[PDB]
Design a protein around this ligand. Structure first.
Ligand SMILES: CCc1ccc2c(c1)[C@@H](NC[C@@H](O)[C@@H]1Cc3cccc(c3)CCCCCCCC(=O)N1)CC1(CCC1)O2
Length: 371
């Protein structure tokens, strides 16, 4: 059953997690970035100095041109290419083969990354943000539609070169401890959610909860950092400076420009505080919280070096890998909800741990959303 999928993700820190797939007949093999923050399936389809493999569609008897072009801009980076369809499968995935839309990438800028080991991207989000428009069915919808695979997947992202598991079609109990807690998908476009309270070492940040969701808050495996709206980010960096003022670090540290280090095994984890996000629950006035350690928001790179992986955004809250690596995360599309549980590959600290706890009580959670 789901064991076949356990450990099917690999990666380099800060360059995403990818899963092996094949496209066309005879099977061509590629490593595909797993991206809950977008919704196209796209693949290098012509030489590029950072690809060492690409989809040669001349060689596939199942290739079908759709004779349209397509374009997709990400946060930094973008590509254009040629749309068609072909047959796709996931070797360490369910035992099945589908006809999926596929963008053949013909040009790009700052998309592909020097020796990342992946050659395309699997957008796992919803049609609403697909390019060219919402009518280009994304991979997972084609998968669900053509097979009997249930409409959910789960992700266990391990930090520290990295690995994890993408379980397609269900939940694997070996990948987590404690219970799952769920938050409603507010709208099916990105995996959007509502954060209703933020605390840093015990203390509310005390803003209107709307500022947490200003624009939107999304769960995005293709983003590295915890990204926060300006006002919130400012507020969270004050409080993380104050919690840790035992030592002072440059400014390029807090802007993520420069690293910080300590003799191997000396990192003063205890001076850095836990962050808690409280998320909208399943029941009336009910929330739960996820807590993350400094071992998550200080990304590593004879002394131990780290980058501050909380960054400013003008485009909403992004719960990226920093946040996901704490937990097993269940994208339960069928019930419109996202599950969090403590991960089995949690980055454990001697005196504290990453947690998912509830219930808590929070009034007017719907009003924390932005319109
Ligand atoms: C619809 C396409 C799109 C456009 C903008 C965009 C998003 C999606 C959201 N998802 C970001 C994610 O798709 C990409 C995927 C990606 C692309 C290229 C390379 C990677 C990862 C590997 C990681 C490189 C460093 C992080 C790059 C951030 C990013 O844009 N990730 C995240 C947001 C919406 C809030 C910020 O911005």
């Amino acid at each position: 059953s789901f064991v076949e999928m356990v450990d099917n993700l690999r990666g380099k820190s800060g360059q995403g997690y990818y899963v092996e797939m094949t496209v066309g007949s005879p099977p061509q093999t590629l490593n595909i970035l797993v991206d809950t923050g977008s919704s196209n399936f796209a693949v290098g389809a012509a030489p590029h100095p950072f690809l060492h493999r690409y989809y040669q569609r001349q060689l596939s008897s199942t290739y079908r041109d759709l004779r349209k072009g397509v374009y997709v801009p990400y946060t930094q980076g973008k590509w254009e290419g040629e749309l068609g369809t072909d047959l796709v499968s996931i070797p360490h995935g369910p035992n099945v083969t589908v006809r999926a839309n596929i963008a053949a990438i013909t040009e790009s800028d700052k998309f592909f990354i020097n020796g990342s080991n992946w050659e395309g991207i699997l957008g796992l989000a919803y049609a609403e943000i697909a390019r060219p428009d919402d009518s280009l069915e994304p991979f997972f919808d084609s998968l669900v539609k053509q097979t009997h695979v249930p409409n959910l997947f789960s992700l266990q992202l391990c930090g520290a070169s990295v690995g994890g598991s993408m379980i397609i079609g269900g939940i694997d109990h070996s990948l987590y401890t404690g219970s799952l807690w769920y938050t409603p998908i507010r709208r099916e476009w990105y995996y959007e959610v509502i954060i209703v309270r933020v605390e840093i070492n015990g203390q509310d940040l005390k803003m209107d909860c709307k500022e947490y969701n200003y624009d939107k808050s999304i769960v995005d495996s293709g983003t590295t950092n915890l990204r926060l709206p300006k006002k919130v980010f400012e507020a969270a960096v004050k409080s993380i400076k104050a919690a840790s003022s035992t030592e002072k670090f440059p400014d390029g540290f807090w802007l993520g420009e420069q690293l910080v280090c300590w003799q191997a095994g000396t990192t003063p984890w205890n001076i850095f505080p836990v962050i808690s996000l409280y998320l909208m629950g399943e029941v009336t006035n009910q929330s739960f919280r996820i807590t993350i350690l400094p071992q998550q928001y200080l990304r590593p790179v004879q002394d131990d070096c780290y980058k501050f992986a909380i960054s400013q955004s003008s485009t909403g809250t992004v719960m990226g890998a920093v946040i996901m690596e704490g937990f097993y995360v269940v994208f339960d599309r069928a019930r419109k909800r996202i599950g969090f549980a403590v991960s089995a590959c949690h980055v454990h600290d001697e005196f504290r741990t990453a947690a998912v706890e509830g219930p808590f009580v929070t009034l007017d959670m719907e009003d924390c959303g932005y319109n």
